[PDB]
Amino acid sequence: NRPNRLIVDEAINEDNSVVSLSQPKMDELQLFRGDTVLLKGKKRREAVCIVLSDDTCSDEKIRMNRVVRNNLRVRLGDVISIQPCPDVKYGKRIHVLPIDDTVEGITGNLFEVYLKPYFLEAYRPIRKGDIFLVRGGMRAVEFKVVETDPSPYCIVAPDTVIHCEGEPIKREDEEESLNEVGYDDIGGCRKQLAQIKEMVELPLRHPALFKAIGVKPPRGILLYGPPGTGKTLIARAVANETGAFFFLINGPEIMSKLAGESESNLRKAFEEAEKNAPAIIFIDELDAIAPKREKTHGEVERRIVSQLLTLMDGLKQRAHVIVMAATNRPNSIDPALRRFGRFDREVDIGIPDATGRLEILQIHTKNMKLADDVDLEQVANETHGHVGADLAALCSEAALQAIRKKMDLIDLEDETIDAEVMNSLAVTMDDFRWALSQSNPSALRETVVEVPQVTWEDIGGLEDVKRELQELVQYPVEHPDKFLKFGMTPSKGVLFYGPPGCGKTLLAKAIANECQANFISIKGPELLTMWFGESEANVREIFDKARQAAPCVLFFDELDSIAKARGGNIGDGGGAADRVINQILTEMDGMSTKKNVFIIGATNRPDIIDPAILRPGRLDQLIYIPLPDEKSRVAILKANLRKSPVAKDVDLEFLAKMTNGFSGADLTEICQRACKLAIRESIESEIVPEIRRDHFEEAMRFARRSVSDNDIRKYEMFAQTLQQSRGF
Amino acid sequence: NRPNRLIVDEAINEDNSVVSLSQPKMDELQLFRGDTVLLKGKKRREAVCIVLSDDTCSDEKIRMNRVVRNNLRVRLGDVISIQPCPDVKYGKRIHVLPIDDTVEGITGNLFEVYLKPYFLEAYRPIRKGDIFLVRGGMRAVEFKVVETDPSPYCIVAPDTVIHCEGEPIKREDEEESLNEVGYDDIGGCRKQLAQIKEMVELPLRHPALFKAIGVKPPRGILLYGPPGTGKTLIARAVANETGAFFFLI
Numbered sequence A: 001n002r003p004n005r006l007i008v009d010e011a012i013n014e015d016n017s018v019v020s021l022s023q024p025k026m027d028e029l030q031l032f033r034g035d036t037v038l039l040k041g042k043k044r045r046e047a048v049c050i051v052l053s054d055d056t057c058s059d060e061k062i063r064m065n066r067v068v069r070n071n072l073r074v075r076l077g078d079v080i081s082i083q084p085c086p087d088v089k090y091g092k093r094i095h096v097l098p099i100d101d102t103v104e105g106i107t108g109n110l111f112e113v114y115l116k117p118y119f120l121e122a123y124r125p126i127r128k129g130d131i132f133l134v135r136g137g138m139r140a141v142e143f144k145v146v147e148t149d150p151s152p153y154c155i156v157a158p159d160t161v162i163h164c165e166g167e168p169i170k171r172e173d174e175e176e177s178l179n180e181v182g183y184d185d186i187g188g189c190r191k192q193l194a195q196i197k198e199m200v201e202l203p204l205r206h207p208a209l210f211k212a213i214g215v216k217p218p219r220g221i222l223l224y225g226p227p228g229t230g231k232t233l234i235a236r237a238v239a240n241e242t243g244a245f246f247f248l249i250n251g252p253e254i255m256s257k258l259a260g261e262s263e264s265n266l267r268k269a270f271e272e273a274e275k276n277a278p279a280i281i282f283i284d285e286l287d288a289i290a291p292k293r294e295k296t297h298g299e300v301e302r303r304i305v306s307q308l309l310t311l312m313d314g315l316k317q318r319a320h321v322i323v324m325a326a327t328n329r330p331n332s333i334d335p336a337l338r339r340f341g342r343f344d345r346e347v348d349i350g351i352p353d354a355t356g357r358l359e360i361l362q363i364h365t366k367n368m369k370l371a372d373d374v375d376l377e378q379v380a381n382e383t384h385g386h387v388g389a390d391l392a393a394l395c396s397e398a399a400l401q402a403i404r405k406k407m408d409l410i411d412l413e414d415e416t417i418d419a420e421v422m423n424s425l426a427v428t429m430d431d432f433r434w435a436l437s438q439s440n441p442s443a444l445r446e447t448v449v450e451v452p453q454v455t456w457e458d459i460g461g462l463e464d465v466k467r468e469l470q471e472l473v474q475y476p477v478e479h480p481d482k483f484l485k486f487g488m489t490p491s492k493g494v495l496f497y498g499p500p501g502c503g504k505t506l507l508a509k510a511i512a513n514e515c516q517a518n519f520i521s522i523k524g525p526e527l528l529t530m531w532f533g534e535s536e537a538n539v540r541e542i543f544d545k546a547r548q549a550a551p552c553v554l555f556f557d558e559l560d561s562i563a564k565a566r567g568g569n570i571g572d573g574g575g576a577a578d579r580v581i582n583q584i585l586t587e588m589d590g591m592s593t594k595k596n597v598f599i600i601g602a603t604n605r606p607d608i609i610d611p612a613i614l615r616p617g618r619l620d621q622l623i624y625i626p627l628p629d630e631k632s633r634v635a636i637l638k639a640n641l642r643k644s645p646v647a648k649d650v651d652l653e654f655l656a657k658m659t660n661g662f663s664g665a666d667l668t669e670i671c672q673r674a675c676k677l678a679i680r681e682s683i684e685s686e687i688v689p690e691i692r693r694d695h696f697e698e699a700m701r702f703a704r705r706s707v708s709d710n711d712i713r714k715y716e717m718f719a720q721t722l723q724q725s726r727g728f
Numbered sequence B: 001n002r003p004n005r006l007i008v009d010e011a012i013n014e015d016n017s018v019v020s021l022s023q024p025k026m027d028e029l030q031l032f033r034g035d036t037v038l039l040k041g042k043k044r045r046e047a048v049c050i051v052l053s054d055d056t057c058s059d060e061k062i063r064m065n066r067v068v069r070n071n072l073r074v075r076l077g078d079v080i081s082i083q084p085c086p087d088v089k090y091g092k093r094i095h096v097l098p099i100d101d102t103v104e105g106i107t108g109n110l111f112e113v114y115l116k117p118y119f120l121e122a123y124r125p126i127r128k129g130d131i132f133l134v135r136g137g138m139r140a141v142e143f144k145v146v147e148t149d150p151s152p153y154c155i156v157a158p159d160t161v162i163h164c165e166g167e168p169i170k171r172e173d174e175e176e177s178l179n180e181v182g183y184d185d186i187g188g189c190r191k192q193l194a195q196i197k198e199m200v201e202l203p204l205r206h207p208a209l210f211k212a213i214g215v216k217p218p219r220g221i222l223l224y225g226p227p228g229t230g231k232t233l234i235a236r237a238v239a240n241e242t243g244a245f246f247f248l249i
């Protein structure tokens, strides 16, 4: 249907007037990447913009910003027409003025702060119907053109004289503000937007088709995640972005109201928003109003949760609605709300990663001006547990640390301030380092699921067991073609066992990095404290959080501490078991081989373990991690100092010889002392940097075999037969 | 912006009429540490005080007491002007009288208990607009001067004959009492005041700037600690000291 029909999509780049396409559309287009284009759009309102080319788009799709996409009165997923035409020319007048409340409280000269610096060397097209936004000085400014050089197009040149009175504008009746949230105000969530985006999209954009079909569009959604994670943000974003009518319910709000006042208040919310459909209904803190465990005292609270049910279930299809609620943990809410015809969908919005945090940090760092020494790629690596709302108050508190010490000397106090200071005001790296050091980065910290940073090169030796792990994880994910042809079935779990400090934890994080699978780590002590006094109930959740993360490596680390809890050494009269070992391996038997979740245990004392976990179908492959030997003992040293400035004098072949029964962790203990003996001489020297050969000679003096000899023969005995361990 | 612009700060020393500065401001100043200075301040009300020098202040900052800082109608973090001038001279009359309820229940001779022992060998400047406080006898006494030797300055000498009827005064409509809590009535908390002090300060003193900016000033605070630790004290102190309107639940 011709290359006059294009679709809307949301840009990767942040720049104001551009559109990004691909070469197939270019081999359809045959026009430049420096050209101007005049686009046609809905409601007789159209606008002028330029194009470039790039791979991130598909064969056919169109990247835009909101500032473009709003004037065109279009939304993501609309048919647009680029109209590839070269009308190219300069314009003349281009008289602009600021917008109603967008300048409220800021005053003064706008030429050198705003406007001018935005146009320079990047002449930007303009039309009588372009509103645009300029970022700076802690503020988002909005503009409009009542007249310019006559239409359609005007293209600035590094001359053109712009003239502006200032003063507000009349607020446009229907024209949205750009300060309303949209898919660009959310970051780190990319994967769960597209999930929410598909699922809610077409029944909002295409109310008719469903009325034409017998398909039931899912209507109800539950968003998980700990507080401050952006649940309420993601909700309103979608409602704005999709065009829907967004009504909002607070839990406390309707539990604040008088008994019997809530019922009419909760009922009206649907009844009213029934009339305005298509409609979103968002319920903040569903936990407040529907808390069924031992639930509540007295009817009036037990009554309102049954009112909610008869609205969800007793929804007859009404006309058209979709309900969205939010809560901190999936639990604590009445189970009867998750049945079908009620909130059947679930979207778990976890904490962000560093790649997510940098995405967030840039969003709250946009509008403000920064010094050149800032990094923000390092910050994301120094903020560990942080949700989005922590990481926003880390930007706004760092920026108040800047404007206290800067303008206390200016000490100017009046009704409003103008932009020159703000423009010549910046935040430095010393502030971020300061606001990161307060207790504000105190933040919620719980089970994290991520792709690990460790690579294969980060571990030395072990080259064959590296080859065997990729057999057992890489391939069944890579080649589902095979394993049908030859039949059989992949084995699910693995068990590493060996001397302490020999590399088991690392080698589990390496394959996750290799297959880009998520990695969940559950350490024996942590697992056994949540059992607390005689109760846990959270184990089934780490298998859930593993299930919705697939492909996933699920790693049970230092699995020996649990068995020695029941008892170690001499031993009890009984075997080594707890009620938290049993509910693990009921749940292993639960997960299907069609799942690509993959389990790995590790133990430093194979002597003690429960045979139940070795049974075929639980942890079958047994892998014995030996101590390193000379040629590998170089690989270890060669590795962990890869970031250390070692001097040329050293012989790593020589270290590796004098050492024999050292663990890989104890080699790092030598390399550790050497480096800390270096810094003592340097610090002395303040009354030259480079690790020295003599240093390694002194460190090597105090080195310590971490594993005894007489216990090496014990690993060598279990290396042979640990299969025998079950049955007697 | 010239060495006529100084800022307010809270003194380390406890003595009544002094101001503490540093040498960089002195190499800006070039006047004595025994001199008298006449300071200018807000609301057309100003007062006379003397200076010394010390390290505890920064390069540029000014230590005061509340008894100075109130007459000037200023609060910590205001631009003040010291006006380094040597007008030095003695005065003559200096007639003082006690304040409305500040003497309630205490009576009798005030000469040998109050007043006199406070002036001795440490002649203290005085102006028609100085209210001062003397400590002793389980009580905090407050005074004022309706007239003295003509203005601006009067500087006592170890002679000058003060005369006082006694009797209350009319309670000044807006003039704060010195018995209200302030940062000097709290101790051992120095480190967590400065924390609370930064965090609440500018959005109270500068309501406008935030209305001019997109920054969100944190508004809500939780104070921990076991009972009797001074939580309620620290709260009202800040409210008084910062000027804010303090409601209590």
Ligand SMILES: Nc1ncnc2c1ncn2[C@@H]1O[C@H](COP(=O)(O)OP(=O)(O)OP(O)(O)=S)[C@@H](O)[C@H]1O
Pocket (backbone or CB within 6 Å): A458, A459, A460, A461, A462, A499, A500, A501, A502, A503, A504, A505, A506, A507, A602, A604, A636, A639, A640, A663, A664, A665, A666, A668
């Ligand atoms: N092959 C190896 N390559 C690099 N580092 C190693 C290796 N083996 C041990 N290490 C060091 O040991 C530390 C982590 O040891 P792990 O890989 O967890 O071995 P582990 O025996 O499972 O753990 P523990 O605590 O020593 S019982 C790392 O900081 C490494 O410096």
Ligand SMILES: Nc1ncnc2c1ncn2[C@@H]1O[C@H](COP(=O)(O)OP(=O)(O)O)[C@@H](O)[C@H]1O
Pocket (backbone or CB within 6 Å): A185, A186, A187, A188, A189, A226, A227, A228, A229, A230, A231, A232, A233, A234, A360, A363, A387, A388, A389, A390, A392
């Ligand atoms: N993914 C994200 N991207 C950008 N900002 C975020 C994100 N997650 C959280 N925030 C920040 O969190 C703050 C409030 O989050 P909120 O919507 O209240 O989450 P919740 O409702 O889950 O508590 C907002 O200021 C927003 O800036």
Ligand SMILES: Nc1ncnc2c1ncn2[C@@H]1O[C@H](COP(=O)(O)OP(=O)(O)O)[C@@H](O)[C@H]1O
Pocket (backbone or CB within 6 Å): B185, B186, B187, B188, B189, B226, B227, B228, B229, B230, B231, B232, B233, B234
């Ligand atoms: N840091 C402090 N400095 C001076 N006085 C204190 C301090 N902490 C407590 N007090 C004394 O405690 C008394 C009452 O404390 P209060 O304000 O009731 O504390 P809270 O409200 O925490 O119980 C006051 O008389 C005050 O004299």
Ligand SMILES: [Mg+2]
Pocket (backbone or CB within 6 Å): A504, A505, A557
């Ligand atoms: Mg380990």
